Amino acid sequence: GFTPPELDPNTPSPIFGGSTGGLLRKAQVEEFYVITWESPKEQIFEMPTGGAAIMREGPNLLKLARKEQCLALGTRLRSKYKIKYQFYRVFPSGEVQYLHPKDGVYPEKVNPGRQGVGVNFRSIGKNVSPIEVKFTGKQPYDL
Amino acid sequence: GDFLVHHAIALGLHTTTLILVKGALDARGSKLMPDKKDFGYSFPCDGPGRGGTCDISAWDAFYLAVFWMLNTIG
Amino acid sequence: MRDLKTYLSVAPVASTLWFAALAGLLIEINRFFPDALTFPFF
Amino acid sequence: PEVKILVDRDPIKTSFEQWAKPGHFSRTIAKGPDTTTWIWNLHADAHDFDSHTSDLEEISRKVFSAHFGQLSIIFLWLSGMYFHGARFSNYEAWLNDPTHIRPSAQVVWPIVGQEILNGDVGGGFRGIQITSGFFQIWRASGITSELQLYCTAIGALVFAALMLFAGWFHYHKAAPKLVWFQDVESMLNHHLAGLLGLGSLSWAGHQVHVSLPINQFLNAGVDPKEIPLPHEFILNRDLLAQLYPSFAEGATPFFTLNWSKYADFLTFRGGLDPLTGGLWLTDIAHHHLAIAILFLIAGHMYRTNWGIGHGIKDILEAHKGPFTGQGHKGLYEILTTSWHAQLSINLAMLGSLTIIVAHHMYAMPPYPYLATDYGTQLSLFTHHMWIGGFLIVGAAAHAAIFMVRDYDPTTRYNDLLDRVLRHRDAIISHLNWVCIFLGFHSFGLYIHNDTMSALGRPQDMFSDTAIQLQPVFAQWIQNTHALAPGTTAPGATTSTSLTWGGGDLVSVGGKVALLPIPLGTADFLVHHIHAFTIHVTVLILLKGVLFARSSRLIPDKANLGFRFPCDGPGRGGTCQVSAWDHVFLGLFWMYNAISVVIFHFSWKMQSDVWGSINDQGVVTHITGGNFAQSSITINGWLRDFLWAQASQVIQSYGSSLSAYGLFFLGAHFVWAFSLMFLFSGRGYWQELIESIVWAHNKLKVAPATQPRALSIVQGRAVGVTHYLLGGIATTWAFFLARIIAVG
Amino acid sequence: SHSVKIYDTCIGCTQCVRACPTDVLEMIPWGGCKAKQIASAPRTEDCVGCKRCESACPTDFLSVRVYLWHETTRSMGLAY
Amino acid sequence: QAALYTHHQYIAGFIMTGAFAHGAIFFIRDYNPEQNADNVLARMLEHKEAIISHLSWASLFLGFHTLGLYVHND
Amino acid sequence: MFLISWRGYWQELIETLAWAHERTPLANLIRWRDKPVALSIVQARLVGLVHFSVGYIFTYAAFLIASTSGKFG
Amino acid sequence: YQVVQPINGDPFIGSLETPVTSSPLVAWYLSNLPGYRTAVNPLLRGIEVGLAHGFLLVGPFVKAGPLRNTEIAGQAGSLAAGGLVVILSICLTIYGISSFNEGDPSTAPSLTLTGRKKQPDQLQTADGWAKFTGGFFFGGISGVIWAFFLLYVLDLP
Ligand code: CLA
Ligand code: CLA
Ligand code: CLA
Ligand code: CLA
Numbered sequence A: 001g002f003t004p005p006e007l008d009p010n011t012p013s014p015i016f017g018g019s020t021g022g023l024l025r026k027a028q029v030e031e032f033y034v035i036t037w038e039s040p041k042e043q044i045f046e047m048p049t050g051g052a053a054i055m056r057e058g059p060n061l062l063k064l065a066r067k068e069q070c071l072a073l074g075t076r077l078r079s080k081y082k083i084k085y086q087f088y089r090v091f092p093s094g095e096v097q098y099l100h101p102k103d104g105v106y107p108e109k110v111n112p113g114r115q116g117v118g119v120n121f122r123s124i125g126k127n128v129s130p131i132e133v134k135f136t137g138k139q140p141y142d143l
Numbered sequence B: 001g002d003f004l005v006h007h008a009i010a011l012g013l014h015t016t017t018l019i020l021v022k023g024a025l026d027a028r029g030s031k032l033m034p035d036k037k038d039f040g041y042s043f044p045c046d047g048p049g050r051g052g053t054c055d056i057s058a059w060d061a062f063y064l065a066v067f068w069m070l071n072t073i074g
Numbered sequence C: 001m002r003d004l005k006t007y008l009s010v011a012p013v014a015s016t017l018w019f020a021a022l023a024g025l026l027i028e029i030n031r032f033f034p035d036a037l038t039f040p041f042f
Numbered sequence D: 001p002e003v004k005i006l007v008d009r010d011p012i013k014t015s016f017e018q019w020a021k022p023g024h025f026s027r028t029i030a031k032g033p034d035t036t037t038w039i040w041n042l043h044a045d046a047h048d049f050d051s052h053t054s055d056l057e058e059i060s061r062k063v064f065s066a067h068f069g070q071l072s073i074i075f076l077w078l079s080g081m082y083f084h085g086a087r088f089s090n091y092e093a094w095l096n097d098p099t100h101i102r103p104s105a106q107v108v109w110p111i112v113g114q115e116i117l118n119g120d121v122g123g124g125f126r127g128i129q130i131t132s133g134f135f136q137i138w139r140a141s142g143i144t145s146e147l148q149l150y151c152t153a154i155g156a157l158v159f160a161a162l163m164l165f166a167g168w169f170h171y172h173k174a175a176p177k178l179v180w181f182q183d184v185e186s187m188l189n190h191h192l193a194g195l196l197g198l199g200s201l202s203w204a205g206h207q208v209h210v211s212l213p214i215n216q217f218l219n220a221g222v223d224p225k226e227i228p229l230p231h232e233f234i235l236n237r238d239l240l241a242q243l244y245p246s247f248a249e250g251a252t253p254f255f256t257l258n259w260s261k262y263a264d265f266l267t268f269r270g271g272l273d274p275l276t277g278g279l280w281l282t283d284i285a286h287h288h289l290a291i292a293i294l295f296l297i298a299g300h301m302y303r304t305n306w307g308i309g310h311g312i313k314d315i316l317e318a319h320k321g322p323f324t325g326q327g328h329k330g331l332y333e334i335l336t337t338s339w340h341a342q343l344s345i346n347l348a349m350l351g352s353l354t355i356i357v358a359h360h361m362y363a364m365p366p367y368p369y370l371a372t373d374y375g376t377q378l379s380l381f382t383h384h385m386w387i388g389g390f391l392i393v394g395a396a397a398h399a400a401i402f403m404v405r406d407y408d409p410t411t412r413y414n415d416l417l418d419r420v421l422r423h424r425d426a427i428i429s430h431l432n433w434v435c436i437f438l439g440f441h442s443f444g445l446y447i448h449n450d451t452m453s454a455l456g457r458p459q460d461m462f463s464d465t466a467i468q469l470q471p472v473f474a475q476w477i478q479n480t481h482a483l484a485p486g487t488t489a490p491g492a493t494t495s496t497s498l499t500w501g502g503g504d505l506v507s508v509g510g511k512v513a514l515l516p517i518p519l520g521t522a523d524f525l526v527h528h529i530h531a532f533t534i535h536v537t538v539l540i541l542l543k544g545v546l547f548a549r550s551s552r553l554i555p556d557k558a559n560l561g562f563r564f565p566c567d568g569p570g571r572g573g574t575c576q577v578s579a580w581d582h583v584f585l586g587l588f589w590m591y592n593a594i595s596v597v598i599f600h601f602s603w604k605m606q607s608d609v610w611g612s613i614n615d616q617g618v619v620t621h622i623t624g625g626n627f628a629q630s631s632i633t634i635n636g637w638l639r640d641f642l643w644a645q646a647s648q649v650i651q652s653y654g655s656s657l658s659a660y661g662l663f664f665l666g667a668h669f670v671w672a673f674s675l676m677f678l679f680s681g682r683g684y685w686q687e688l689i690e691s692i693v694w695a696h697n698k699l700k701v702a703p704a705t706q707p708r709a710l711s712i713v714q715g716r717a718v719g720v721t722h723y724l725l726g727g728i729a730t731t732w733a734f735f736l737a738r739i740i741a742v743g
Numbered sequence E: 001s002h003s004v005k006i007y008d009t010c011i012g013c014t015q016c017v018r019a020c021p022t023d024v025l026e027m028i029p030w031g032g033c034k035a036k037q038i039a040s041a042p043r044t045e046d047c048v049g050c051k052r053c054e055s056a057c058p059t060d061f062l063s064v065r066v067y068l069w070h071e072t073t074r075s076m077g078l079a080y
Numbered sequence F: 001q002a003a004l005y006t007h008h009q010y011i012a013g014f015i016m017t018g019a020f021a022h023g024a025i026f027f028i029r030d031y032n033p034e035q036n037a038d039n040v041l042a043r044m045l046e047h048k049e050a051i052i053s054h055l056s057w058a059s060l061f062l063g064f065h066t067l068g069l070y071v072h073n074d
Numbered sequence G: 001m002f003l004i005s006w007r008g009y010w011q012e013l014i015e016t017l018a019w020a021h022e023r024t025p026l027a028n029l030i031r032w033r034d035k036p037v038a039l040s041i042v043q044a045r046l047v048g049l050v051h052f053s054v055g056y057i058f059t060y061a062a063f064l065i066a067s068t069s070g071k072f073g
Numbered sequence H: 001y002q003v004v005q006p007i008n009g010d011p012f013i014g015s016l017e018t019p020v021t022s023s024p025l026v027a028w029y030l031s032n033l034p035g036y037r038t039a040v041n042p043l044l045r046g047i048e049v050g051l052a053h054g055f056l057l058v059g060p061f062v063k064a065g066p067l068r069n070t071e072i073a074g075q076a077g078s079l080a081a082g083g084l085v086v087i088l089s090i091c092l093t094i095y096g097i098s099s100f101n102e103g104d105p106s107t108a109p110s111l112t113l114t115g116r117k118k119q120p121d122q123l124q125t126a127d128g129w130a131k132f133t134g135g136f137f138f139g140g141i142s143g144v145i146w147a148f149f150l151l152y153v154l155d156l157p
């Protein structure tokens, strides 16, 4: 059992002068992303989009344009610094969707509450020939 | 002069034929991509893994052979 | 000394020695038997 | 902070043990090959020192000794040129009759039929005509006998040995400490004042004591064997005084500031000597003297051990403003840390310099009998353009390697760099737009002219006879240069260059040297082509640098390295996102730009400059002034330039120029050969190789080093290398056959 | 979205998950190998199709497969 | 006569490349290995490396020697 | 172009262009209905082969017909 | 003291504030162009835009056109500018037809730079866009006619 931490607005954002690498209309009408982390101090870190920003001591909130930017920055926060991070997807309705770490456990560490998806129980060479799924909507790897 | 150009023409027929035949016989798979039949006639590639796999599809073999055909008919 | 002979056994160096010998040979053969579209000795 | 000599003793042991361990420098490569890919990596990583080790001191020591190796090779090469000038040249016969004899410094052996390449170059000499220019240098240096060339070749060989020795010495015996390299103020002070200053002064010395007098006897028609030896001018000052009377004073006017009395052999006349067609040697010696003073002064700007002077860090930090923040703060730390940064700036400036040299040497021919030797002049201009362009693309490559490898805002921060990175999208978007605008409004005008000319509407073209696009600004400039002497340069007797000033056509041996170069709609259109091509090259390379770290498509791009093929077929496909692939793409555009530049040079010079002159002064240009009316259309370039001027190289068979015909066709061949690599991909080739490998295993002759297709990156590198070699060598053969036959 | 599948040749070395730049893959428990874990692709709607996972797999042949399929804003890696 | 000869030779070339293209597409989409077991068609796939390797040999021989003779004469 | 330049170069370039359009006054009054992206990998192979072939055929056709008909013999 | 700041204070919205972007002169001038008059009927803004542009297009067509040196028809080369107004008006029309459906509300922003709620421009509606297209056509034809009406006492006729 794991309860995703809710996104807390009014969480401070890093010190940064602005860049052309930030959000666009996509964030207004489609979706954007938010990564939060806890920092032990004020540090300089490389922004996945602009140049250099100053991570604030304590909780940090950072809105990014793509999920991959959140995961890249988080990978670095966990690597260069030793910082726990989470990030979420945010729709223009205000709805928030917690994304990562999905279990509260990082996905490279096996966690027992996890259900198999897209797992085929056979060697890859035992997939059927296309002719055997022709005119059916299926793909030989969907089995 | 006709001897020499006839052997160039033989070269073009053999090379174009080599590209197309290898493309057709390796369309279902190779050692680099044994499951190629599962990816269809035309796909970009199979990524930079396993050494790099650009132009590994059968459609790519056609695309390559058209150059040799234009050369031969030239 | 042993290491130097080893270096001289390496692919590019052995190749330059080998093809340089071959080139001198073929050059001298074309020097004593120039032109020649055929094997004339039958 | 006390600058001093710092080295370490015996850091690396001189041994053949690692000669026998291929890839010793790399921990992975040293394990030897499991596949053929190993063999390529061994050569691609050999000079990538900062990938071998992370210790800045070791890297700096490798760099230093490597530079010694380079200089050794250069001295061996100069030894070759002087030795061939002494032993296998017609340089003395040419020295007698320069306007007729063709310079030749290479002779071929009679083995397989190739002796036909030993052509009639004059002076009873059979050989290959040389376009390097060494004869005009040697004449300008007062060199007369082959013996002097021998002595120079021996000295050059000795210096090759000394440089090589110093490389081994400073890598294996006394290897400087890292602090020694980072003493930037000392280095700049010694290269400004010591290297450039004392070099220019020394050369001024040789010129006033050797070059000027010996060239006076040459110009006066004296036989070179009868000319006094250069040291006889140093001993008996009466020889010089007869030639140059000022030498009777004993350098007393120099100390008494009577320097105007030296206006005899130190002059500001400008223009060209009408006998030799080269710049006045008095002006040149005076020039090297002034340059010597300027650099000797410039070498005292930086503080070292005596408190006076500048620290460069101070200068940087003081320079900041309301738009750039704290800018320049941090650059001293970057430029004393990253070799790739220094190599980037130095490649940029050295290539740009080489291009400037290319212009200044044609518009101001510095050596005697150089301007009228059109093969040498075309060869020099084209050559230095190529060197410059290559060097600049290199500057982009190493700016990118800095960004990927040495950039770290948490350690060595710079405000200017951060701000640039913070509006990279604006910069690249605007450069993109300018490139499109320039494409349309330079090349689209050509297409306009081709279409109007084909439709029978030459009055609707862009032409000096239809819709004129006059380069009014450049015309005004060259007018101002023409009016400069006596007005804004009262000391200057004539124009700065004969391309400016009207009249004063200079002819040598019936051939013209320089006359005023006209400018019109054709020159306008071409110049905007050059603007266009340069802007697109800058776009590709700068875009490569600024997005090497990251982008909206790939946020973690810097973790993939400087040189990587892609990040896969996803995100729509990400091939050629690496900064390396931006250098790859920019090489083609440097080729395009420089190609159009040298075509513009050959075309314009043969049309409006070079040619023969009548006894009564009627000039016939090599081509009939057809630049203005034929270059304003792409069909005119295809027909009146390429199709016309290629006749020599396709007609060279059976002559001594047939080698240029062979290289014409062969360079076409390697260029087309590159298209195999550039248009395909290694997956196909690896599969084919699987079948070939099957065939070898069938006969027990499959190799242990498993055959592999080239890497994606290597496919690209091979491709661009053969593309560039083929194109450049094709234009090489074309140019040399053309200008050697018709020049 | 791109399809991503795991095959029971998987040995549970976790490298596909470690390589993934959009967090598509997880390690779930399993009894078929010694590491007692097998990969899974529960979030392929975020899959961009770069095949870093495939570059990371040590199994011969692969135990992750990315079948590039219907493109979306997320699969094309668009930040706009 | 020139225009027609050129016309039909280029048409013929494109048609040939297409023929091989659809051979490959056949192998991917329609080919049923079990239903063609051990017949001539499956045996094409079974010894594809001999086929491809010998086309490679013929193309290399023709290329080496035709190009070599042209270059010698030049 | 389509045969030597590959996609990622153009995709990043187009991203800078999207930024440019959204941040330009008067022009950002106009919005695209379809997100501008660089051509696909295969699509570029096809487009470049088609340009290569059209240029091939049209070049040789012009030379053939002009060189023969110009002489008619 | 520094001249460049993030856009509207938010440093993670992808843009910057410069003398070019946010300046009283620039902000006033852009705010006083018809396209940026959000409360005005789009038909009138289209009138102004069409008048300005249609008037502008006459110059290059007449002076650079094929009949430019036949002053008898060269002056009448303004028909070409009229035709370009027609084509542009087609482009506008199909842009609106493609972009806006009948009953959809405006897609323009309903906020100001200072955060207060705003009423969105009707230009970004199907009816508002149709009105702006009709206005641009009318004003464009009219501006071409007005420029062609003046052939006299101009250094470049
Ligand atoms: C004279 C004897 C000598 C000996 C036995 C050694 C021994 C060694 N050196 Mg040293 N060194 C020497 C001279 C010598 N060096 C000289 C003269 C220089 C000045 C250039 C250097 C500068 C130097 C550096 C900077 C480094 C070494 C390194 C090394 C070690 C690595 C092994 C190796 O170098 O393989 C190399 C084998 C080769 C054959 C190298 C050939 C390179 C030549 C000079 C290029 C020739 C250019 C060629 C003409 C281009 C035309 C090509 C054309 C035909 C296509 C090794 C123990 C490296 C090290 O420390 O290892 C960790 C290291 O980085 N040396
Ligand atoms: C002038 C252009 C050119 C050239 C010379 C080649 C050459 C070749 N192609 Mg290629 N191709 C080209 C363009 C070209 N291609 C283009 C534009 C495309 C579209 C991308 C393709 C796509 C392509 C495919 C898909 C295939 C080929 C194949 C082949 C090989 C055919 C067999 C052969 O002819 O034996 C050899 C012929 C030669 C001409 C080799 C020339 C070099 C000789 C050996 C020089 C000898 C070295 C000499 C001593 C100098 C040494 C230099 C020194 C620095 C070391 C051959 C090496 C087929 C193949 O691999 O065959 C097995 C194959 O499947 N090509
Ligand atoms: C294949 C069809 C086609 C046709 C029929 C034309 C016809 C014409 N072109 Mg065009 N052109 C075409 C294709 C075509 N072009 C393409 C594909 C390109 C891109 C390369 C061009 C680019 C081009 C340029 C750059 C120019 C022309 C010009 C001309 C005119 C030159 C003759 C002239 O001086 O008349 C008379 C000259 C006039 C100015 C009379 C104007 C004609 C009136 C305005 C017609 C009214 C138009 C109509 C209301 C709206 C049309 C759209 C309609 C479907 C709703 C002529 C009427 C020239 C031109 O138009 O001059 C400005 C010229 O500048 N063409
Ligand atoms: C007036 C003193 C002086 C002079 C003349 C030079 C000259 C040169 N330096 Mg050096 N340098 C100096 C002081 C000097 N340096 C100082 C104070 C520092 C900082 C501590 C550096 C550190 C430095 C580095 C890191 C490098 C150079 C390099 C070079 C060469 C650049 C390429 C070139 O121009 O080739 C032109 C060729 C010539 C002018 C031929 C004459 C060269 C003679 C033989 C050397 C004369 C000066 C020499 C230092 C005297 C010491 C010899 C003695 C100790 C035995 C060049 C020969 C590069 C290099 O090492 O290339 C191998 C390079 O990497 N310099």
Ligand code: CLA
Residues within 6 Å of the ligand: D043, D044, D045, D046, D047, D048, D049, D343, D347, D390, D391, D392, D393, D394, D395, D397, D401, D563, D580, D583, D584, D587, D721, D725
């Ligand atoms: C003084 C200038 C200078 C210096 C010192 C360097 C130094 C370096 N460069 Mg740079 N670069 C330069 C200029 C320079 N470069 C220029 C002018 C360009 C434009 C082309 C580049 C573009 C560039 C790129 C794209 C890359 C580098 C890389 C590197 C590093 C690896 C070098 C290596 O091991 O390759 C080994 C050398 C070879 C394998 C030789 C290759 C043979 C060439 C391709 C053929 C030459 C043809 C010949 C002249 C003519 C035909 C003769 C033939 C028939 C025999 C190294 C530190 C690489 C790197 O990874 O950086 C870390 C890299 O990717 N450079």
Ligand code: CLA
Residues within 6 Å of the ligand: D431, D432, D433, D435, D436, D437, D438, D439, D440, D443, D444, D447, D536, D539, D540, D585, D588, D589, G001, G002, G004, G005, G009, G013
């Ligand atoms: C002749 C071949 C060719 C052509 C036409 C182009 C064209 C272009 N390249 Mg490319 N390139 C080429 C070869 C070519 N390239 C090759 C071989 C490579 C591999 C190395 C590259 C790699 C490359 C890179 C990496 C880049 C470019 C860029 C560009 C663009 C530069 C901006 C510009 O000039 O816009 C204007 C367009 C032109 C000058 C083309 C001609 C325009 C005609 C004359 C106008 C006709 C319009 C008419 C109305 C048509 C309508 C008719 C109707 C029926 C539709 C441009 C469109 C740069 C870019 O993206 O742009 C900034 C860029 O970064 N190229």
Ligand SMILES: CC1=C(/C=C/C(C)=C/C=C/C(C)=C/C=C/C=C(C)/C=C/C=C(C)/C=C/C2=C(C)CCCC2(C)C)C(C)(C)CCC1
Residues within 6 Å of the ligand: B024, F019, F020, F022, F023, F024, F026, F027
């Ligand atoms: C009568 C006569 C004669 C004879 C002749 C003969 C006997 C021949 C024939 C010939 C032949 C014999 C030919 C052929 C050709 C062929 C081709 C051209 C082919 C092709 C193929 C393909 C294209 C394939 C396809 C495919 C694949 C790949 C797989 C799948 C299936 C299929 C089939 C689809 C002579 C001349 C002596 C003389 C006169 C008379």
Ligand code: SF4
Residues within 6 Å of the ligand: B044, B045, B046, B047, B048, B052, B053, B054, B055, D565, D566, D567, D568, D569, D570, D573, D574, D575, D576, D681, D712, G006, G041
């Ligand atoms: S470069 Fe090759 S591996 Fe990379 S995305 Fe393109 S086709 Fe695929």
Ligand code: SF4
Residues within 6 Å of the ligand: D570, E004, E019, E020, E021, E022, E023, E024, E025, E046, E047, E048, E049, E050, E051, E052, E053, E054, E066
């Ligand atoms: S293709 Fe890339 S994004 Fe998709 S699952 Fe594999 S690593 Fe993750």
Ligand code: SF4
Residues within 6 Å of the ligand: E006, E007, E009, E010, E011, E012, E013, E014, E015, E016, E017, E038, E039, E053, E056, E057, E058, E059, E062, E063, E064
């Ligand atoms: S890389 Fe392969 S073996 Fe390793 S966890 Fe992923 S699917 Fe399993």
